[PDB]
Ligand binder design. Structure first.
Ligand code: NDG
Ligand code: CL
Ligand code: CL
Ligand code: CL
Ligand code: CL
Ligand code: CL
Ligand code: NA
Length: 129
């Protein structure tokens, strides 16, 4: 599924990401955009042989099971295939575990590089939330 900007903000808000650990909705929408282009079906293979899955590009080394990342963890307790769903429940519940892991939203390099210190409120400007 490819989400509209306002469509994803409402879903993220509905699932309780707005000001989750001090991070406004704009941060999560900005991150979605640069990670996945709002495409729930986004996969990217990394040099290390782990793979990033879904709207927030969650990594198989630590967070999910794809059965082909040797010596990896499954800290979110999900098949990585569950992160590609049009229902964002699984991605959001895992994101919550990741942003609490000590480094906050720095866990998403695209966020550090493209959203951090930006007017991220621009991403929810106009939407009925
Ligand atoms: C929180 C999280 O899993 N983010 C992932 C990161 O782990 C991975 O290294 C990167 C790919 O370079 O994609 C995302 O940023
Ligand atoms: Cl957009
Ligand atoms: Cl915001
Ligand atoms: Cl594995
Ligand atoms: Cl949803
Ligand atoms: Cl933080
Ligand atoms: Na894994």
């Amino acid at each position: 599924k490819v989400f509209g900007r306002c469509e994803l903000a409402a879903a993220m808000k509905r699932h309780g990401l707005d000001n989750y650990r001090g991070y406004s909705l704009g941060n999560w929408v900005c991150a979605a955009k640069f990670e996945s282009n709002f495409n729930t079906q986004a996969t990217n293979r990394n040099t290390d042989g782990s793979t990033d899955y879904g709207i927030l590009q969650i990594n198989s080394r630590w967070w999910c099971n794809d059965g082909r990342t040797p010596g990896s963890r499954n800290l979110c307790n999900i098949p990585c295939s569950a992160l590609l769903s049009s229902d964002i429940t699984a991605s959001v519940n895992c994101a919550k575990k990741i942003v609490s892991d000590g480094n906050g939203m720095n866990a998403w390099v695209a966020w550090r590089n493209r959203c951090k210190g930006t007017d991220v409120q621009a991403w929810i400007r106009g939407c009925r939330l």
